[PDB]
Write a protein that binds this DNA or RNA. Sequence first.
RNA 1: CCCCGCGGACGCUACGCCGCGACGAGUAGGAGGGCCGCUGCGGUGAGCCUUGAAGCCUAGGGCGCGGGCCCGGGUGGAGC
RNA 2: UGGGCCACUUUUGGUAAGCAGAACUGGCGCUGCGGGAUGAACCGAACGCCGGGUUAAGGCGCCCGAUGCCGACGCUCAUCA
RNA 3: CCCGUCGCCGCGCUCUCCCCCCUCCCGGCGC
Lengths: 128, 112, 125, 63, 236, 109
Amino acid sequence: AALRPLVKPKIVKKRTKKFIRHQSDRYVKIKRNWRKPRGIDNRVRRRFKGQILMPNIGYGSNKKTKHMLPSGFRKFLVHNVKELEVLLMCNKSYCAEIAHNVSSKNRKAIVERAAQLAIRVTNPNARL
Amino acid sequence: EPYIAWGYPNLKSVNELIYKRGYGKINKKRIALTDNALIARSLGKYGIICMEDLIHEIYTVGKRFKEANNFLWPFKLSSPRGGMKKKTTHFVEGGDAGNREDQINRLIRRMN
Amino acid sequence: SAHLQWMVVRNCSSFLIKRNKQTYSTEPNNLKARNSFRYNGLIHRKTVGVEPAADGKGVVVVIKRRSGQRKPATSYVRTTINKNARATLSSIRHMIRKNKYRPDLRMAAIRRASAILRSQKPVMV
Amino acid sequence: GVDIRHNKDRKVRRKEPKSQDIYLRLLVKLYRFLARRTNSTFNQVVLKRLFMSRTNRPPLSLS
Amino acid sequence: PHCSRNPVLVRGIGRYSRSAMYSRKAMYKRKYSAAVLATVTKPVGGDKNGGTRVVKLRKMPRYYPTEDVPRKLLSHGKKPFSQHVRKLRASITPGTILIILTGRHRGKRVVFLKQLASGLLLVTGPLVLNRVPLRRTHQKFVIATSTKIDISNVKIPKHLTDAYFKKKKLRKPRHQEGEIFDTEKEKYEITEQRKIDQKAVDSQILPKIKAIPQLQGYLRSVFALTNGIYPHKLVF
Amino acid sequence: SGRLWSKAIFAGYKRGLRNQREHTALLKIEGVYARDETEFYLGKRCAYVYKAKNNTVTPGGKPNKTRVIWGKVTRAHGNSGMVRAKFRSNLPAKAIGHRIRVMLYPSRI
RNA sequence: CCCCGCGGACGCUACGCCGCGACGAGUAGGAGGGCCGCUGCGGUGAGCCUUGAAGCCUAGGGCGCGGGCCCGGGUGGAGC
RNA sequence: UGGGCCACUUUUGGUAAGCAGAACUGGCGCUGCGGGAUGAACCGAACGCCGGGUUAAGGCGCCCGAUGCCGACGCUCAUCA
RNA sequence: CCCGUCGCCGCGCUCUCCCCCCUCCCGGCGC
Ligand SMILES: [Mg+2]
Ligand SMILES: [Mg+2]
Ligand SMILES: [Mg+2]
Ligand SMILES: [Mg+2]
Ligand SMILES: [Mg+2]
Ligand SMILES: [Mg+2]
Ligand SMILES: [Mg+2]
Ligand SMILES: [Mg+2]
Ligand SMILES: [Mg+2]
Ligand SMILES: [Mg+2]
Ligand SMILES: [Mg+2]
Ligand SMILES: [Mg+2]
Ligand SMILES: [Mg+2]
Ligand SMILES: [Mg+2]
Ligand SMILES: [Mg+2]
Ligand SMILES: [Mg+2]
Ligand SMILES: [Mg+2]
Ligand SMILES: [Mg+2]
C-alpha cells in the first residue's frame, strides 16, 4: 500500500511522557514548558524520591532511530515542487510533508508530483 | 586495614582471576586479554608473551612482577555472593577486614 | 579552485537548504542533492549530472567541458538518452567509466537515472 | 563510585584555528593529513603552530 | 573415505593427541610436496545478418534503488532450523503414555510413537479410545507418564514424516479483491489415505493395549487437577 | 474437562519497604510452602485472566469479554514457596489477592 | 602486456565520517553548545498567501533529553 | 566567598547546657539513594536512562519484601516487664 | 561476477594400501 522505508528498526523511547514543569498543575500562570528549578529549598531540583523528574542527557534517543517518525521515516518540510525534487534521491528514509500555509490548489500539485516520484507524504490529504 | 581484605591466593585463584577478569592496560585503555598477541605486544620485552607467562610471573613473583602486575588493570569484582558476614570489623574478630591468610581464596570464588 | 570555492559556499550559498536536522543543495548538477564537496555541482573542474528530459520521456545527462571553465554559456554539454532502462544505464555507465570522467559519481548517476526513469513510467492502478 | 578528580579531565589546547581564514583552514587541512600520514614530528609541530593565536606566533625579525 | 580414526571422549576433544594421530593417520609416509560459462553463442538468424550473436546470460539490472543496505557480518554459528539437533527428553521413550496439555485434545492421554525429524513427537491416541488421530505434538507441551507399552516389533509406515503432517492450504487462486467468499474447505477433509494409515497403526497397537488391564479405560479418561492434589507432589 | 492449571494468587510486586518494583510480581502458589518445592514451577507460564466491558478477539473462539495478561515464573522468592514472576506487562494493582493461573506449560517433567 | 564477457554497493556537509577506553552528584560561581525563542536590518529562498497571512481554539498526528517545533481540523480575514 | 554548623577523638571556661572557645579528620552546608518508624550531620553508599545478577548497613510474626528453619544452648514473670 | 559459508583457534577425511563389523540399488532369493 504505502511506501515502505529502507529499514524499519525497532524504535525504543527511554521516556514517552512529557517533562512537565514543577508546580505547573497548581497554577494556570505556570505553563507545562520545562523550567529548571533554581530554588535553594526546591525538592525537585534536589531530586527527592517521588518528585517531578528533571530532564537530562541520559534520556537521549538512539542515534539510529532519532527523529524517526513512527513509520521508519524522517520528516522534511516542503513548500513547493522544487523542494520536493531534493528528496528524489533519498526517497526511502525521508518523507515530505507540506507546510500549513501552502494553498489548496498548490498542494494538490505537490501531492501528484510526490506520487510519481515515489516520495511519501505525511499529510497527502489536507485541503479536501 | 579497615578498608581492605587481603590474603594469600593460590594457583587456582590466580588462574580464574586472570582468565575471567583479566584486562590489560594498553595505551591507557582497558583492553580485555582475549588473545596472546595483546600481551606479547606490551610485555614481550620481558619474555611474558602469553597468558600462561602472565600467570607464572604473578603466582611465582618474578623479576618482572612490577611490569606484569601494572600491565593488568585492577580487577573489577562483583559483590560477594552469599554475603560477607561483616564489613566494619577485622576478620579475626568475626568481620571481613584485615588479613585472612588462605581464606581470601574462599572470598575470591564468591567475588568473581 | 574546488577546495577554495568550497570553503566559501559550504555554509553560505543560495542553493543551501538547511531544515529539520537535514541539509540539501539545489544546484543543477548535484546528484543526490546533498551539501558535499564530492557532489557539489558548481565548484569542480569536471562535473556530471542527469535531469529528466524536456518532454515526458528520457534522461538528459549533462557533462561539463574543460575549455570554457570560465564561460558558463558553453561550459556544459547535454545529451538526451531515450532508450530502454537497461540501455541508458549502460550508456551513462560507459559515459563515466570509459571516459574516466569523475568515476566516483558513477553509481550516483546510475541510481539517479533509475529514479528518473521509473518516475517517467506511468502509475498503474 | 570510583574516587577521581574530574577537574583536570579536559585538556585545554587548540584543536583547530580560532580564525575563519579559509586559506589558513586549507593549509591546516594539508598539514593535518601530513602529520597523520607521516611519522615526521616536524609536521606535528607545524600543525600545532597553525592553530596558535597571533600572540603565540610572534613576528620573526629578518636579523 | 575412512572413518574418523579419532574417537571423541568429550565434545571438542579427541581421544588421541597430535603425535598419536600422526602415527595413526600414517602421515610419516604419505607426505605430498607439490602437484562458467558467462555467455552462450546462439546462431545468426540471418540471412546476411551474419555473425552469431554472442548473448550473455546473467544480464545487467535495468533499475537501481535509490539506496541499498550494507551486507551483514559473518556469524560462524547459527545453523538453520532444518539442520539443528533435535533433543528428546530422557523420560519420553517410544511406547510411553503422554498427556497433551495445550491443544484441542487438552488433557487427553495418548501413546507416544517415534519422534519426527523436526523434533515434534508423533503421538497417537488409539483413535477408537480417546479420539486423537495420528498427529504431531510438541515435546515441551506434554507430560511423560511412567506408563509404557513395549511397541517394539511395530511397523510405523515410512511415509509418516513432517511433510506428511504439514498443514495444507487452498487460498487464494487468481483472486485478490475478496468480495465473493470461498465458502468451501472450511471442512478440512480427512483424506482416505490418513484413514488407512490410522487403521494400520491402531490395529497393531490396540491388542498390545488390551493386554495390560484397564489401560483402555485409563486412555479414555482425561487428566485434571482437583481441589486436592498439586502437580509438584504428583509422581507421573 | 478439568482444571489443568495450578491456582496461584497475586501477593504484590517485588519491593523493598519504601520502593516497589512493578516489573516483577510475587506469586503464592497453593500447596508450595518451601523453596525446594518451587523447582517444579520455575519456568511454567502463568496467566492473569480477567474480564472487561468490550469484547476482544479470542484465539480459537468467538470474541468475548475475557482478557489475559501472560507471563512466566522466573525464580523463587524466599524460604517458603513464594515464586516471583515476570509478566508481559506489569499487572494492575487491582489484581493483588486475586487468581493467577500456572499452566503446566513448558514442562520438564 | 587481465578478461566468453567491459563489470564491481555505501562513503569523505574533512566545521565530515568512523573506532576504542574511561567516566557522569552539585548550591554560589565560571565556561561551551543551542537546527531553543522574540523583534528589526542587509542578502537569499524564480519562498508562502483571498483556491485564504498573522493571531487564537483544539479528547487530532507526531518529533526533540530539553528549550521548543512541525503537521491535521476549526475560527479569522491580509499579510508572513 | 570572607555569618558557618555537626560527629569520633584531644581539649579550655562553666554545676551543666541542643552553652561558649580551640586541634585533627570527615561530613552537612552544596547531596539525592538504602537503613535508624520520624530527622541537615548517625550506619551503608554517593547519583546519566534502563534490564538481569549480587551485596552493604539493616532486617525476615502482621502492618511490610524476607526464617511458614521441625534452627541450637541457656536466662527471665514484671499488680509501671 | 547468484549472496565474502571469512580471520585466529581446535579438529576429521582424501590425494597409500590392506583388513574386520553392520550393510545395499541388491541377483535370483527358502526364511
Ligand atoms: Mg517526548
Ligand atoms: Mg499550568
Ligand atoms: Mg538548603
Ligand atoms: Mg541468592
Ligand atoms: Mg565508622
Ligand atoms: Mg564533579
Ligand atoms: Mg557514575
Ligand atoms: Mg553534572
Ligand atoms: Mg491558521
Ligand atoms: Mg556576609
Ligand atoms: Mg560550639
Ligand atoms: Mg563538595
Ligand atoms: Mg550525603
Ligand atoms: Mg533514609
Ligand atoms: Mg528511633
Ligand atoms: Mg538492579
Ligand atoms: Mg522493619
Ligand atoms: Mg511478608
